PDB file of C-alpha atoms (C1' of nucleotides) in Angstrom:
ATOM      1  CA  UNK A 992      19.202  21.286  15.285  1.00 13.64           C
ATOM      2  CA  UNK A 993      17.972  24.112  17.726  1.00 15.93           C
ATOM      3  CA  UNK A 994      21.230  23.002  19.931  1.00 17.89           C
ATOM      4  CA  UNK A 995      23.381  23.628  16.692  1.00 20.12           C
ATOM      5  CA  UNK A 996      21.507  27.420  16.582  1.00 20.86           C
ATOM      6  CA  UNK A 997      22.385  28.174  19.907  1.00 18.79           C
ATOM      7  CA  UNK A 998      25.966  26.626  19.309  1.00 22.34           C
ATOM      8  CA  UNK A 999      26.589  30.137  18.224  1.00 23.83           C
ATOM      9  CA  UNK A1000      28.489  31.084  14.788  1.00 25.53           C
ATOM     10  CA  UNK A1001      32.338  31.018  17.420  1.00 24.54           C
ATOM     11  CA  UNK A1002      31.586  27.346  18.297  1.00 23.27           C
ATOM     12  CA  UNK A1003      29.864  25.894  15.357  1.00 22.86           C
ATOM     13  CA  UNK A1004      33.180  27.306  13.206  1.00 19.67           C
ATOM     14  CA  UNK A1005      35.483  25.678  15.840  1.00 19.92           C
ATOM     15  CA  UNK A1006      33.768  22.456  15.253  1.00 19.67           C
ATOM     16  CA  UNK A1007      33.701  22.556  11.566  1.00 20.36           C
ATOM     17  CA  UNK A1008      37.654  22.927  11.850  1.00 21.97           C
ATOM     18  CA  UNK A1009      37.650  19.779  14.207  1.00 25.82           C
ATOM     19  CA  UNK A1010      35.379  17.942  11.718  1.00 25.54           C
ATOM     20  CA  UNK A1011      38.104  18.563   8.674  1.00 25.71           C
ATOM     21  CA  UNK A1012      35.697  20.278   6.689  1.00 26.08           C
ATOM     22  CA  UNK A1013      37.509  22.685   3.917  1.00 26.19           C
ATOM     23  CA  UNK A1014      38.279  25.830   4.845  1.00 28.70           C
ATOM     24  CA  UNK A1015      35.983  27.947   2.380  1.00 29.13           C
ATOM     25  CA  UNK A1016      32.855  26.366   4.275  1.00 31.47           C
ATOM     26  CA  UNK A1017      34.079  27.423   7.600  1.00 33.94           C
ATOM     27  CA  UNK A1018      35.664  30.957   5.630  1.00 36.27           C
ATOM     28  CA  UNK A1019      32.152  32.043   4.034  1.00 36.10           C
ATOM     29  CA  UNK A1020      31.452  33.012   7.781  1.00 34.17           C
ATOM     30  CA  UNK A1021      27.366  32.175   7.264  1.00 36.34           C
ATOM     31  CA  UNK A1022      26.099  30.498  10.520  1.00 36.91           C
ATOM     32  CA  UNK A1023      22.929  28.918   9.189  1.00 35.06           C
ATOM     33  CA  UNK A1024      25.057  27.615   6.380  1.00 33.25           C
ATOM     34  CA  UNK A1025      27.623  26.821   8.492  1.00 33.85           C
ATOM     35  CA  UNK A1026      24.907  24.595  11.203  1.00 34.59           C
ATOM     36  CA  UNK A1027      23.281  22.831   8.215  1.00 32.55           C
ATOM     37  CA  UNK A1028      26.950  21.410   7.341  1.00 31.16           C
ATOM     38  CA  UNK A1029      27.438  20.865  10.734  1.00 27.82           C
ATOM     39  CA  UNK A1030      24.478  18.614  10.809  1.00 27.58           C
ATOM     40  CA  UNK A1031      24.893  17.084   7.553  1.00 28.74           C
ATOM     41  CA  UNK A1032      28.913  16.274   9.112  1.00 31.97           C
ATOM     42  CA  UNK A1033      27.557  14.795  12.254  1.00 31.01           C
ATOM     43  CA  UNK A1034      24.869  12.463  10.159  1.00 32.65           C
ATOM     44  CA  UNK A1035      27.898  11.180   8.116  1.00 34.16           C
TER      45      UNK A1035
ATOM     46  C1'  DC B   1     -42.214 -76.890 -27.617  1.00 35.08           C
ATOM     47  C1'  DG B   2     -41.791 -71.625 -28.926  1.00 36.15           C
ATOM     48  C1'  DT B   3     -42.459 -66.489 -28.023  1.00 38.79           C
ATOM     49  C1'  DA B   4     -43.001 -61.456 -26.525  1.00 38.30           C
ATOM     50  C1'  DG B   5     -43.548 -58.527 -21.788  1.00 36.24           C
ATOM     51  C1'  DG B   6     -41.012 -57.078 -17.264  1.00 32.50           C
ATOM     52  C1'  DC B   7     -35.784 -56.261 -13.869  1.00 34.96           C
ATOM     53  C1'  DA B   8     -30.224 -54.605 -13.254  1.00 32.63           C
ATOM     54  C1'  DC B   9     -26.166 -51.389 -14.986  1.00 32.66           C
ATOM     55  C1'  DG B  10     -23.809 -47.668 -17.911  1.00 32.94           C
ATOM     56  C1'  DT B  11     -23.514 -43.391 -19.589  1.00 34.24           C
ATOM     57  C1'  DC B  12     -25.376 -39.148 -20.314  1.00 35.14           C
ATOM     58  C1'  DT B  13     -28.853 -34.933 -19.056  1.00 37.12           C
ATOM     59  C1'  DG B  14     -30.119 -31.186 -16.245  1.00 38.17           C
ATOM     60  C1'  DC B  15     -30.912 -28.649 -12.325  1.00 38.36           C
ATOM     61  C1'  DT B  16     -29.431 -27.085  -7.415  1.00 36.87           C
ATOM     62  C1'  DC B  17     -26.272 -25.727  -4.044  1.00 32.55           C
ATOM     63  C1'  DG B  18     -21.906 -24.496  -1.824  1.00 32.12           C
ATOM     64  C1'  DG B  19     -17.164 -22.938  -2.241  1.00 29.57           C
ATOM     65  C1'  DC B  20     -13.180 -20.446  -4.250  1.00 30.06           C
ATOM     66  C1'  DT B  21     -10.882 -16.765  -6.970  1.00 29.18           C
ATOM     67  C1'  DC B  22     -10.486 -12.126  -8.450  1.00 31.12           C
ATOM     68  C1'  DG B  23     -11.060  -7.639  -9.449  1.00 30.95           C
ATOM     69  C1'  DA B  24     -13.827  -3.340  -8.831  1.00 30.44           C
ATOM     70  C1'  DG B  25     -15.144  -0.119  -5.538  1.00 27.85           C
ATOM     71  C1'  DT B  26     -14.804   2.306  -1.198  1.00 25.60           C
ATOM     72  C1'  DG B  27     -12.893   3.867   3.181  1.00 26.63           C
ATOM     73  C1'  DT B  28      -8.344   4.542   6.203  1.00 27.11           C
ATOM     74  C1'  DT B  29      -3.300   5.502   7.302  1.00 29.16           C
ATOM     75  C1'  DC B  30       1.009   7.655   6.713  1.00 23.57           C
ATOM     76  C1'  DG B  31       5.056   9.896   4.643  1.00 24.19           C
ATOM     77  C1'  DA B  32       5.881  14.177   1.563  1.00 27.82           C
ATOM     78  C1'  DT B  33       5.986  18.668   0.768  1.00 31.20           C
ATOM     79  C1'  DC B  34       3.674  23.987   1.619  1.00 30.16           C
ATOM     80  C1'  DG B  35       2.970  27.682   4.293  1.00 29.97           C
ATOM     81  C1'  DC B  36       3.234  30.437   8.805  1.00 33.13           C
ATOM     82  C1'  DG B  37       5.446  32.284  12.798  1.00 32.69           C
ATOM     83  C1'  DA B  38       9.516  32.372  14.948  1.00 32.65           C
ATOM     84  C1'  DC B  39      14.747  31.752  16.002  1.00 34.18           C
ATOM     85  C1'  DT B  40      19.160  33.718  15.458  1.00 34.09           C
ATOM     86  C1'  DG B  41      23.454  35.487  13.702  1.00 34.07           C
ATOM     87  C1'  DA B  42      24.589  39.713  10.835  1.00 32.56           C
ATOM     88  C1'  DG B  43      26.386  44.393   8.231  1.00 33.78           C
ATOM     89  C1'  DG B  44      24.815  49.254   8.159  1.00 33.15           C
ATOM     90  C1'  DA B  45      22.008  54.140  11.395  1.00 33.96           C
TER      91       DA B  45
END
DNA sequence: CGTAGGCACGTCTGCTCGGCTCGAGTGTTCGATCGCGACTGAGGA
């Protein structure tokens, strides 16, 4: 979870791409948003 | 010769004691949120 902050909004964004996560998560361009998808992506 | 006064079982009576269940009452542990300070990207001076 703190790794995911630091990931940084550039990286975390890139992932969410790799991921296949729809593109108005990774468009909405909120990085605590965007890390708490992340996470909930990597626990799937 | 007869004839009424003492010995074994059977079943019930009653009290004592020990054990088992069971639920009320009380203390102990652990996840489930609440709040605080802080982290960390973010659009305007």
């Amino acid at each position: 979870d703190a790794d995911l902050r630091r990931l940084s909004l550039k990286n975390a964004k890139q992932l969410l791409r790799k991921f296949g996560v729809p593109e108005e998560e990774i468009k909405k361009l909120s990085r605590w948003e965007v890390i708490d998808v992340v996470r909930t992506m990597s626990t799937e």
